[PDB]
Amino acid sequence: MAHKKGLGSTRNGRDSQAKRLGVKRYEGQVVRAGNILVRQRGTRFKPGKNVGMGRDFTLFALVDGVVEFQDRGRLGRYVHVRPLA
Amino acid sequence: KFRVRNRIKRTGRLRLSVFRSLKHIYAQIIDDEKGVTLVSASSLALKLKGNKTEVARQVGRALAEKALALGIKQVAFDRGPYKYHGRVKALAEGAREG
Amino acid sequence: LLLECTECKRRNYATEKNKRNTPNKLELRKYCPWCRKHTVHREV
Amino acid sequence: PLDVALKRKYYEEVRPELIRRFGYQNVWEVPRLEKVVINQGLGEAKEDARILEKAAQELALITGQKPAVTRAKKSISNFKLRKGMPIGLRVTLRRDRMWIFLEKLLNVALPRIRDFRGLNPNSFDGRGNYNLGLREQLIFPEITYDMVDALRGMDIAVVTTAETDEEARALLELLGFPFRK
């Protein structure tokens, strides 16, 4: 007979489309001016030398150079592009 | 604490860090990205007795002449506990226009 | 309401968003227009 | 001025008395005096034009220093005021102004609280920091009945440079504070 003796109102099918966060130019990448480095929501990666912080903390290289990182422990995880010549 | 840190809101180079003591006033041009102090100037261990506004002007004159003694023209003021005031560095010879 | 600042008996709506109950009523903001730089720009 | 009478009594008797009392090893080791704060709680910000900043002028004419209205940090709905703003009066007296206020307090004001068997020497407890309340604010030598509308009991707190409570006890009891024993 298949006495379909139920229903059910779900309430939790909802998700925002994900944002492709994170870092995009790792340590040693040869980036250019305006090439964004970190796409983040907080400021997990603090901007160092020659790296601007964006409006939503998008780190991005202000010069033509090769990226290098450092974890300054208590201070933060600075991402700075050291320029080349 | 005086946690003020109008230090690290200076990333432009040639950081003129001051120090307004009770006795003297010291001043020193530090270089950034390679932390080496380039020139410096004390006040009372250079010149005039403790009339501190005028001698803080005169230590700045001596420091800017020391800076043009090796040719540095664009710098950036420092010492977060400043309250830029009677500790004067109203100067010539440094084209920061401070 | 969405209100646009006009250069004073002139052009150049500047198009802000006011919060009308909280203050409005001759919204006055110095603003750079398309022509003749800097003015007073009362709203609407 | 600079020659407050209580300040002179401190600088001429009490500091060598505390030295010859405790066997100090420094002139700055003696408990100095650095703070007399006066707080006025004053949760009165209802309707029908309840201004009540006459008490600020009243406290200013007592002490000699215009107190600041301090906005409430946390907003609690038990007493109906909320959202920061309305009232709490604080004044902080340091040097010679603190000394002339204590000349007005210790000799003229307390001797009078309506019974006044003394102060409460269980009130220091660990820091320097002797705190004491006032039920009736008009014991002071400036303000009698015809300058107010209601009773505006403040509480003062005098802070010493004393590490324990025994040191500030021995300081203030010779500066002129009586106590209960």
């Binding site: 379909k4 003796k5 139920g6 229903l7 059910g8 109102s9 779900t10 309430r11 939790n12 | - | - | -």
Partner: protein, 136 residues
């Protein structure tokens, strides 16, 4: 009793923090296979033991059901089930000591913890005493 829970099945994989030693009491039931020990099986084994050695000693239930076992009410598939059919379930991996009896003699302890293992769905060992320790 708190933060939102109709939580997932997980998987009863490898057991290392799932199983260290016997700490409280003397003797201990200890599991030999990962299984879901319900609150009903916990209460069932515990009131087997406390009624076996009557008015006896201490029976420490070191596990605790903290996982909402969920059961749909015999229908198709629209969302998670209503939750907590008998209730909550202690996710138990092997080597975990489930019950410990304290002070009561070996003849009651071995014929009590055996009853607890008989009402539990897990093949068990029963440990005596003198396990892992740390003090100098």
């Amino acid at each position: 009793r708190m933060k939102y829970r109709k939580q997932q099945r997980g998987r009863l994989k490898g057991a290392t923090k799932g199983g260290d030693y016997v700490a409280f009491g003397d003797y201990g039931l200890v599991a030999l296979e990962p299984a879901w020990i319900t609150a009903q099986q916990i209460e069932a084994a515990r009131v087997a033991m406390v009624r076996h050695f009557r008015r006896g000693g201490k029976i420490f239930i070191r596990i605790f059901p903290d996982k909402p076992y969920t059961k749909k009410p015999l229908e198709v598939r629209m969302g998670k089930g209503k939750g907590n059919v008998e209730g909550y379930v202690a996710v138990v991996k092997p080597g975990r000591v489930m019950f410990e009896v304290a002070g009561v003699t070996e003849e009651q302890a071995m014929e009590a913890l055996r009853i607890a293992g008989h009402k539990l769905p897990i093949k068990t060992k029963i440990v005596r005493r003198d396990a892992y320790d740390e003090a100098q």
